[PDB]
CSV table of C-alpha atoms and ligand atoms in Angstrom, one decimal:
chain,number,residue,atom,x,y,z
A,3,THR,CA,2.0,4.0,19.5
A,4,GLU,CA,3.1,5.0,16.0
A,5,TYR,CA,3.0,2.9,12.9
A,6,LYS,CA,5.1,3.6,9.8
A,7,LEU,CA,3.3,2.4,6.7
A,8,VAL,CA,4.6,2.3,3.2
A,9,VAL,CA,2.4,1.8,0.1
A,10,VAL,CA,4.1,0.0,-2.7
A,11,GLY,CA,3.2,-1.1,-6.2
A,12,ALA,CA,3.5,-0.3,-9.9
A,13,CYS,CA,3.2,3.2,-11.4
A,14,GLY,CA,-0.4,4.3,-11.5
A,15,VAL,CA,-2.0,1.6,-9.4
A,16,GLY,CA,-3.4,4.2,-7.0
A,17,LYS,CA,-0.8,4.4,-4.2
A,18,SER,CA,-1.2,8.2,-3.7
A,19,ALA,CA,-4.9,8.2,-4.3
A,20,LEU,CA,-5.4,5.5,-1.6
A,21,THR,CA,-3.3,7.4,0.9
A,22,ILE,CA,-5.1,10.7,0.2
A,23,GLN,CA,-8.5,9.0,0.5
A,24,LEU,CA,-7.4,7.6,3.9
A,25,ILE,CA,-6.0,10.9,5.2
A,26,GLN,CA,-8.2,13.5,3.6
A,27,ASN,CA,-11.3,11.5,2.8
A,28,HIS,CA,-11.3,12.7,-0.8
A,29,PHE,CA,-10.6,11.1,-4.2
A,30,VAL,CA,-8.0,12.9,-6.3
A,31,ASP,CA,-7.4,12.7,-10.1
A,32,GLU,CA,-3.9,14.0,-9.6
A,33,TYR,CA,-1.5,15.5,-6.9
A,34,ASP,CA,1.8,17.4,-6.7
A,35,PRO,CA,4.9,15.8,-5.2
A,36,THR,CA,5.3,17.5,-1.8
A,37,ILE,CA,8.2,18.6,0.5
A,38,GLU,CA,6.4,16.7,3.3
A,39,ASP,CA,7.7,13.2,3.6
A,40,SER,CA,4.6,11.7,5.1
A,41,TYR,CA,1.0,12.1,6.3
A,42,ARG,CA,0.0,11.3,9.9
A,43,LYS,CA,-3.5,10.4,11.1
A,44,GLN,CA,-4.7,9.4,14.5
A,45,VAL,CA,-7.1,6.4,14.5
A,46,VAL,CA,-8.7,4.1,17.0
A,47,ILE,CA,-8.3,0.4,16.1
A,48,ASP,CA,-9.7,-2.3,18.4
A,49,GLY,CA,-10.2,0.2,21.2
A,50,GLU,CA,-6.6,1.5,21.0
A,51,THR,CA,-5.5,5.0,19.8
A,52,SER,CA,-2.9,4.7,17.1
A,53,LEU,CA,-0.9,7.1,15.0
A,54,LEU,CA,-0.6,6.1,11.3
A,55,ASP,CA,2.5,7.6,9.6
A,56,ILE,CA,2.1,7.0,5.8
A,57,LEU,CA,5.0,7.9,3.6
A,58,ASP,CA,4.4,10.2,0.7
A,59,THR,CA,6.9,8.9,-1.9
A,60,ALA,CA,5.6,10.7,-5.0
A,61,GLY,CA,8.4,12.0,-7.1
A,62,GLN,CA,11.5,10.6,-5.3
A,63,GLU,CA,10.2,7.0,-5.6
A,64,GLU,CA,11.7,6.7,-9.1
A,65,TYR,CA,15.2,6.3,-7.5
A,66,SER,CA,16.0,2.8,-6.2
A,67,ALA,CA,18.3,4.1,-3.4
A,68,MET,CA,15.3,6.2,-2.1
A,69,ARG,CA,13.0,3.2,-2.3
A,70,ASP,CA,15.6,1.3,-0.2
A,71,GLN,CA,15.4,4.0,2.4
A,72,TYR,CA,11.6,3.8,2.4
A,73,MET,CA,11.7,0.1,2.8
A,74,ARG,CA,14.1,0.3,5.8
A,75,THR,CA,11.8,3.0,7.2
A,76,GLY,CA,8.5,1.1,6.8
A,77,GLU,CA,7.2,-1.3,9.5
A,78,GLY,CA,4.5,-2.6,7.3
A,79,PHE,CA,3.7,-2.5,3.6
A,80,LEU,CA,0.6,-2.4,1.4
A,81,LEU,CA,1.3,-4.4,-1.8
A,82,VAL,CA,-0.9,-2.6,-4.2
A,83,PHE,CA,-1.9,-3.7,-7.7
A,84,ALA,CA,-4.7,-2.5,-10.0
A,85,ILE,CA,-7.4,-5.0,-10.9
A,86,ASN,CA,-7.4,-3.7,-14.5
A,87,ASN,CA,-3.6,-4.0,-14.8
A,88,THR,CA,-2.3,-7.6,-15.0
A,89,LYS,CA,1.4,-6.5,-15.1
A,90,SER,CA,1.0,-4.7,-11.8
A,91,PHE,CA,-0.3,-7.9,-10.3
A,92,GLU,CA,2.4,-10.1,-11.8
A,93,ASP,CA,5.1,-7.8,-10.3
A,94,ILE,CA,3.8,-8.1,-6.8
A,95,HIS,CA,6.2,-11.0,-6.0
A,96,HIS,CA,9.2,-9.0,-7.1
A,97,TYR,CA,8.2,-6.1,-4.8
A,98,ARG,CA,7.7,-8.4,-1.9
A,99,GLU,CA,11.1,-10.1,-2.4
A,100,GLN,CA,12.8,-6.7,-2.6
A,101,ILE,CA,11.3,-5.7,0.7
A,102,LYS,CA,12.4,-8.9,2.4
A,103,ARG,CA,15.9,-8.5,1.0
A,104,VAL,CA,16.3,-4.9,2.1
A,105,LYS,CA,14.9,-5.5,5.6
A,106,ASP,CA,17.0,-8.6,5.8
A,107,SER,CA,14.0,-10.5,7.1
A,108,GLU,CA,11.6,-13.1,5.8
A,109,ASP,CA,8.0,-12.4,6.9
A,110,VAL,CA,7.5,-8.6,7.0
A,111,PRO,CA,4.0,-7.4,7.8
A,112,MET,CA,2.2,-7.1,4.5
A,113,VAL,CA,-1.3,-6.8,3.0
A,114,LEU,CA,-2.2,-7.5,-0.6
A,115,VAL,CA,-4.5,-4.8,-2.0
A,116,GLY,CA,-6.3,-4.9,-5.3
A,117,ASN,CA,-7.2,-1.3,-6.2
A,118,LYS,CA,-9.6,0.3,-8.7
A,119,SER,CA,-12.4,-2.1,-8.0
A,120,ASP,CA,-14.9,0.4,-9.4
A,121,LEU,CA,-13.5,0.3,-12.9
A,122,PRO,CA,-14.7,-1.9,-15.8
A,123,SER,CA,-12.4,-4.3,-17.7
A,124,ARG,CA,-11.1,-6.2,-14.6
A,125,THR,CA,-8.2,-8.4,-15.7
A,126,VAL,CA,-7.3,-9.8,-12.3
A,127,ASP,CA,-10.0,-12.0,-10.8
A,128,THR,CA,-10.6,-11.9,-7.0
A,129,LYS,CA,-9.8,-15.7,-6.8
A,130,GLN,CA,-6.4,-15.1,-8.5
A,131,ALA,CA,-5.5,-12.4,-5.9
A,132,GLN,CA,-6.8,-14.6,-3.0
A,133,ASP,CA,-4.7,-17.5,-4.2
A,134,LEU,CA,-1.6,-15.3,-4.3
A,135,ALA,CA,-2.3,-13.8,-0.9
A,136,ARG,CA,-2.9,-17.3,0.5
A,137,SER,CA,0.4,-18.5,-0.8
A,138,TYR,CA,2.1,-15.7,1.2
A,139,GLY,CA,-0.3,-16.2,4.1
A,140,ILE,CA,-1.3,-12.5,4.1
A,141,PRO,CA,-4.8,-10.8,3.8
A,142,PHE,CA,-6.2,-9.7,0.5
A,143,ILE,CA,-8.4,-6.6,0.4
A,144,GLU,CA,-10.1,-5.1,-2.7
A,145,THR,CA,-10.2,-1.3,-2.7
A,146,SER,CA,-11.4,1.7,-4.6
A,147,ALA,CA,-9.8,5.0,-3.8
A,148,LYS,CA,-12.7,6.5,-5.7
A,149,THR,CA,-15.6,5.0,-3.8
A,150,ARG,CA,-13.6,4.5,-0.6
A,151,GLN,CA,-14.5,0.8,-0.6
A,152,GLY,CA,-12.0,-1.2,1.5
A,153,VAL,CA,-9.7,1.7,2.1
A,154,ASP,CA,-9.9,1.9,5.9
A,155,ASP,CA,-10.0,-1.9,5.9
A,156,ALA,CA,-6.7,-2.2,4.0
A,157,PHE,CA,-4.8,0.1,6.3
A,158,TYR,CA,-6.3,-1.1,9.5
A,159,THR,CA,-5.6,-4.7,8.6
A,160,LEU,CA,-2.0,-3.7,8.0
A,161,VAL,CA,-1.8,-2.1,11.4
A,162,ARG,CA,-3.3,-5.2,13.1
A,163,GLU,CA,-0.4,-7.2,11.5
A,164,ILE,CA,2.3,-4.8,12.6
A,165,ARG,CA,0.8,-4.7,16.1
A,166,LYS,CA,1.5,-8.4,16.5
A,167,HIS,CA,5.2,-7.8,16.2
A,168,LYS,CA,5.8,-4.3,17.4
B,201,GDP,N1,-11.4,4.9,-11.0
B,201,GDP,C1,-10.4,4.9,-10.1
B,201,GDP,N2,-9.3,5.6,-10.4
B,201,GDP,C2,-8.2,5.5,-9.6
B,201,GDP,C3,-8.3,4.7,-8.3
B,201,GDP,N3,-7.1,4.9,-7.7
B,201,GDP,C4,-6.4,5.7,-8.5
B,201,GDP,N4,-7.0,6.1,-9.6
B,201,GDP,C5,-6.5,7.0,-10.6
B,201,GDP,O1,-5.4,6.4,-11.2
B,201,GDP,C6,-4.4,7.4,-11.5
B,201,GDP,C7,-3.1,7.0,-10.8
B,201,GDP,O2,-3.3,7.1,-9.4
B,201,GDP,P1,-2.0,7.4,-8.5
B,201,GDP,O3,-2.4,7.5,-7.0
B,201,GDP,O4,-1.2,8.6,-9.0
B,201,GDP,O5,-1.1,6.1,-8.8
B,201,GDP,P2,0.3,5.9,-8.1
B,201,GDP,O6,1.4,6.2,-9.1
B,201,GDP,O7,0.3,4.4,-7.7
B,201,GDP,O8,0.5,6.7,-6.8
B,201,GDP,C8,-5.0,8.7,-11.0
B,201,GDP,O9,-5.6,9.4,-12.1
B,201,GDP,C9,-6.1,8.3,-10.0
B,201,GDP,O10,-7.1,9.3,-10.0
B,201,GDP,C10,-9.5,4.0,-8.1
B,201,GDP,O11,-9.7,3.3,-7.1
B,201,GDP,N5,-10.5,4.1,-9.0
B,202,21F,C1,5.0,6.4,-11.9
B,202,21F,C2,6.4,6.0,-12.2
B,202,21F,S1,7.8,6.5,-11.1
B,202,21F,O1,9.0,6.5,-11.8
B,202,21F,O2,7.6,7.9,-10.7
B,202,21F,N1,7.8,5.6,-9.7
B,202,21F,C3,7.9,4.2,-10.1
B,202,21F,C4,9.2,3.7,-9.5
B,202,21F,C5,9.4,2.2,-9.6
B,202,21F,N2,8.2,1.5,-9.0
B,202,21F,C6,8.4,0.4,-8.0
B,202,21F,O3,9.6,0.1,-7.7
B,202,21F,C7,7.2,-0.3,-7.4
B,202,21F,N3,7.5,-1.0,-6.2
B,202,21F,C8,7.9,-0.3,-5.1
B,202,21F,C9,7.5,1.0,-4.8
B,202,21F,C10,7.9,1.7,-3.7
B,202,21F,I1,7.3,3.7,-3.3
B,202,21F,C11,8.8,1.1,-2.7
B,202,21F,CL1,9.3,1.9,-1.3
B,202,21F,C12,9.2,-0.3,-3.0
B,202,21F,C13,8.8,-0.9,-4.1
B,202,21F,O4,9.2,-2.3,-4.4
B,202,21F,C14,9.8,-3.0,-3.4
B,202,21F,C15,6.9,1.9,-9.4
B,202,21F,C16,6.7,3.4,-9.6
B,203,MG,MG1,1.9,8.4,-6.5
């Protein structure tokens, strides 16, 4: 019934912007860290009503112990990098490994997300991202929190993965 999703990735790749676009249908330039721990949205996916619970980690995410808590909480994870930020892409494998270690489980439902597809000066090619995703055996989705391209697709794909195991 309820799916706990956690969006992960480097500082400034668009984690909050993607979540807010999914929940509020608006693009933000900025946001305040909030007392609320998550946003919840009812959606219908493949004919079934589902509740998406997406953690709002802004602020407290800087603490590793808190990230450990978020990872234990999450059922599925969006691995987000920014297509104009090579380092954010190169760090994806570290984040993936950390999640697997914390959850004490190989193969945790994940989707690779390349965000900011609307911006110029792409430094990560689509084929690069697809190759990485293929190596993990997970879907790759290009997104823009600004234009909303791929946003619903990214989160719904993640839900479909989680649904196969819980
Ligand atoms: N043009 C564009 N800007 C974005 C996109 N996603 C996020 N941003 C901007 O990038 C900055 C960092 O986004 P933010 O959500 O705070 O990154 P976070 O640290 O990963 O949560 C903000 O100024 C956003 O407005 C996108 O898809 N396109
Ligand atoms: C904008 C900088 S910050 O200090 O406020 N937040 C940083 C903290 C470190 N960081 C990551 O560890 C990125 N990966 C990641 C994010 C989250 I939220 C969770 Cl739950 C797990 C991971 O890695 C497993 C980037 C932003
Ligand atoms: Mg944020």
